[PDB]
């Protein structure tokens, strides 16, 4: 059920933070098959493959693709355009319809932490280290 | 719908509102950059001034640095305004999606959300204009209310109020730029018809 | 009929799920819904592709049915149902949404054939795999948009061009797209395709440079490894950046302008000295290990520059260096009116105007 | 007819509104004001913070006094009944606790539980170590207390937003004011 790495993209073609899991050992981790997955998503949003319908007012989930045994997600949320992506692979996959709502568990309370990090009043305004560095904390309290 | 969720009182939020003004005359006429009180602390000394005061030397103040006073005003607003409409997103309003091509639809948004959150009550009327120039219109503006004019000096008045509304100024400028650009947006009077302010975007 | 046909193949789904047993032939039952709704949605023209979605759910929820590396097999069977679902979504000459389809659909056979191929010919998987990737390339690069995907499909061909030694280098010579995934935004690929880049001007032995410009330089390397030393980790990679400077050093070629980034320098008050006043002592923090340059502050007065304060000498090797800048020849009988317009260039045989 | 029930008996007739998305970052964004106009200075802020919180406190003792009749008190038995009890109760829906006084009970400690001026702040490091933040409280703490005829003197002694001990607030009685009668 934990993820194999988060993304969080803002408005333009920038990562706020591209966090994985597990740093501290090296364990065969490439950041850089990470980072390719992150870019094409950030392409995959204006596909006609899929579509974000905005009759409903609550923001929702899609299954964009799946590459190299890793299936990612990618809610956009509609207003303040923030565009969020989290993976997973199919050995915690269950594929199942009762974790569907776990993962969207999963995507609201990184989003809460995302808009509770940012609302910190004494963090000086513009894109500072201090944003990055209270989010692997938060991150780190979340997924050991 | 009905959500009962923790809660403060709405007096002590309007008086702190209220005291911001002389806050930013305090900060701004002592920058300590090199008639009053004192007061005793431990090893320690304060010098402070008291608000009507304060409010006064806004009366006798520069003109330069008058507006050099409302653009902290207009800075707190726009920084309160950012992060209280990106709490609002937590909301999920259904009308717009960002940059604000349909101007009005957010303007749907902010009498109907954004101020019953701040001022307890829908902005009452909004006029057309379709220029983009859209004319907000409250008979009773909150904060206001409990401002007692003196007798029979209203053109004094009328001076110690209006720097109070600086503070929607940023609140409204800064909800227009959590969701993107800053655009021309001013301050009105309207007089009221039946028994406060009105105000101007782009 | 469709939206009863969607619904209650929904629902007849569900309920034939409610039964447990017998789900290996149940596949079968799952294959004969499939078909029914793509009966029903045969003449569709973005809703089909929406059908390929009811497709690759389904070509997800079977991936999630079999669990083996032997159901790798399977998914080569899956590969199967792909192609010949290929050749369900076949029946167009040219479209803009049928080829982001054809795309994705070519993206997933190929994920699933590298991943049955490295389960255990060698040199003509490279040819096959460059082969498709190629068509690939070429079907996501016919269309309007999708420059995202389409750039890292060229940084993964020119890999698997580097993945064989190979002198011809796509992405080094694409320093206007490495410039792209490194300029900002990026971190990462582009840490590696600055590797690639230096590794294969490692293996060039040639300097016939880059014809898309003017720039003919043996330099163009040194001047790739600027950026990649301002993007490097940490000081453990610093013999990289150390490597790289004493090769420029060796192959000097001087003419540079650097932004500096990588080291930074703060100044001090003015003071005097015997004979000419020394004045503006500064300190001094960089990653390099060895550094001896004629750095020099300049100063700009009402209408004229001092220029002064230089040292030819330089064996610091620390943060807070602490130089002294002796300001010999002080203009304007050492007036107070100089300001600040400080180049502060440290050229250690190229010039890096901070 | 006890503190504890005027103090809850008065949130039935009380306005009211929500307590996190405004009056939290109300403070934090005053205190973000006085962070960069001071250039992040960390004791300069605490003065402008406890002479904004006198005035306040100066100005809030008559709605205080007003909203529930009360007599003049006089020990500090009787004020930590009715802070604690109503005071925090009605302006800020909280109730602390009291602890630690003297063998004269000249004085007492004011240990708070849900702090609503500080909900996730996380204060960073050069301000963890000589800031202190709710300065707005112990500014109100004098200026109400000194309009009942009580020279006082509130100082914070620790909080959760930098240490492990809890949020904290000391307090001297200083003696009683004289209230002034004649003509001269």
């Not at chain 3, 389809?101 to 060698?122: F, H, I, P, Y």
């Not at chain 3, 080291?263 to 503006?280: C, M, R």
């Not at chain 4, 960073?124 to 800031?131: I, N, T």
């Amino acid at each position: 059920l934990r993820p194999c790495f988060v993304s969080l993209i803002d408005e333009s073609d920038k990562p706020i933070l591209i966090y994985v899991p597990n740093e501290a050992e090296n364990e065969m981790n490439d950041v850089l098959k990470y980072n390719v997955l992150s870019n094409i998503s950030l392409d995959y949003f204006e596909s006609a493959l899929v579509e974000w319908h905005s009759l409903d007012s609550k923001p929702l989930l899609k299954s964009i693709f799946q590459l190299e045994g890793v299936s990612v997600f990618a809610m956009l949320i509609k207003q303040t355009g923030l565009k969020i992506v989290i993976g997973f692979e199919q050995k915690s996959l269950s594929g199942a319809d009762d974790e569907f709502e776990a993962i969207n568990q999963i995507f609201e309370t990184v989003r809460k932490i995302y808009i509770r990090v940012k609302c910190n009043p004494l963090l000086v305004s513009g894109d500072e280290k201090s944003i990055i560095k209270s989010l692997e904390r938060k991150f780190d309290e979340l997924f050991i | 719908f009905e959500n009962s969720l923790p809660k403060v009182s709405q007096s002590v939020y309007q008086m702190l509102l209220n005291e911001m003004v002389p806050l930013a005359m305090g900060i701004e006429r002592q920058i300590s950059g090199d008639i009053k009180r004192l007061k005793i602390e431990e090893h320690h000394t304060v010098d402070i001034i008291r608000s009507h005061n304060l409010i006064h030397e806004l009366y006798k103040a520069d003109e330069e640095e008058k507006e050099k006073v409302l653009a902290r005003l207009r800075n707190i607003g726009f920084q309160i305004g950012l992060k209280l409409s990106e709490l609002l997103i937590f909301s999920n309003n259904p009308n717009l999606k960002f940059k604000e091509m349909d101007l009005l639809l957010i303007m749907k948004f902010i009498c109907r959300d954004v101020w019953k959150q701040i001022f307890g009550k829908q902005i009452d009327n909004l006029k057309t204009n379709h220029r983009g120039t859209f004319y907000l219109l409250d008979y009773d503006y909150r904060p206001i209310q409990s401002f007692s004019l003196e007798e029979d000096a209203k053109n004094e008045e009328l001076k110690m109020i209006e720097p109070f509304l600086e503070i929607p100024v940023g609140i409204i400028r800064g909800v227009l730029s959590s969701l993107g650009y800053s655009s021309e947006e001013v301050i009105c009077l309207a007089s009221f018809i039946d028994r406060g302010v009105s105000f101007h975007v782009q | 009929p469709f939206e009863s046909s969607s619904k209650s193949d929904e629902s007849l789904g569900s309920i034939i799920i409610e039964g447990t047993l017998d789900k290996f032939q149940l596949h079968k039952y799952f294959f004969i819904r499939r078909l029914r709704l793509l009966k029903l949605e045969d003449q569709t023209l973005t809703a089909f592709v929406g059908a390929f979605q009811l497709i690759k759910n389904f070509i997800e929820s079977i991936s999630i049915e079999y669990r083996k590396s032997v159901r790798l097999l399977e998914f080569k069977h899956y590969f199967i149902t792909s192609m010949l679902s290929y050749f369900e979504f076949e029946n167009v000459s040219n479209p803009l949404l049928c080829e982001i389809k054809a795309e994705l659909l070519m993206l997933k056979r190929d994920n699933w054939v590298q991943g049955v191929m490295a389960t255990s010919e060698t040199v003509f998987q490279e040819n096959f795999l460059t082969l498709t990737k190629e068509i690939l390339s070429l079907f996501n690069k016919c269309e309007g948009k999708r420059q995202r995907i389409v750039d890292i499909l060229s940084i993964e061909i020119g890999l698997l061009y580097y993945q064989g030694k190979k002198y011809e280098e796509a992405v080094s010579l694409f320093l206007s797209c490495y410039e792209y995934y490194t300029q900002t935004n990026w971190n990462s690929i582009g840490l590696k395709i600055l590797q690639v880049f230096i590794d294969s001007l490692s293996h060039c032995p040639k300097l016939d440079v880059l014809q898309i410009d003017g720039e003919s330089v043996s330099a163009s390397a040194v001047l790739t490894n600027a950026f990649l030393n301002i993007l490097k980790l940490c000081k453990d990679n610093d013999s990289k950046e150390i490597w790289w400077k004493k090769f420029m050093d060796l192959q000097m070629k001087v003419h540079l302008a650097r932004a500096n980034v990588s080291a930074i320098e703060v100044n001090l008050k003015s003071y005097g000295f015997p004979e000419d006043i020394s004045t503006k002592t500064m300190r001094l923090s960089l990653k390099n290990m060895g550094g001896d340059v004629i750095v020099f502050g300049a100063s700009d007065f009402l209408l004229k520059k001092g220029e002064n304060k230089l040292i030819l000498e330089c064996r610091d090797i620390m943060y807070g260096e602490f130089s002294l800048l002796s300001f010999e020849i002080i203009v304007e009988g050492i007036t107070f009116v100089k300001e600040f317009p400080e180049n502060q260039d440290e050229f250690i045989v190229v010039p890096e105007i901070y | 007819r006890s503190l504890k029930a005027m103090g809850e008996e008065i949130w039935k007739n009380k306005t009211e509104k929500i307590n996190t998305e405004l009056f939290t970052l109300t403070y934090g964004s005053i205190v973000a004001q006085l962070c960069q106009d001071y250039e992040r200075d960390f004791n300069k802020v605490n003065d402008h913070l406890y002479s904004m919180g006198y005035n306040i406190g100066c100005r809030l003792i008559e709605d205080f006094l007003a909203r529930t009749a009360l007599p003049r008190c006089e020990n500090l038995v009787k004020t930590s009944e009715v802070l604690s009890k109503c005071a925090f109760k009605i302006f800020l829906n909280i109730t602390p606790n009291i602890t630690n006084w003297s063998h004269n009970k000249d004085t007492f400690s004011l240990i708070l539980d849900e702090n609503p001026l500080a909900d996730f702040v996380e204060l960073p490091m050069d301000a963890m170590k000589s800031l202190w933040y709710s300065n707005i409280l112990c500014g109100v703490l004098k200026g109400s207390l000194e309009m009942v005829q009580l020279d006082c003197d509130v100082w914070f002694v620790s909080d959760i937003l930098r240490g492990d001990s809890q949020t904290e607030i000391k307090v001297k009685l200083n003696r009683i004011l004289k209230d002034e009668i004649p003509i001269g």
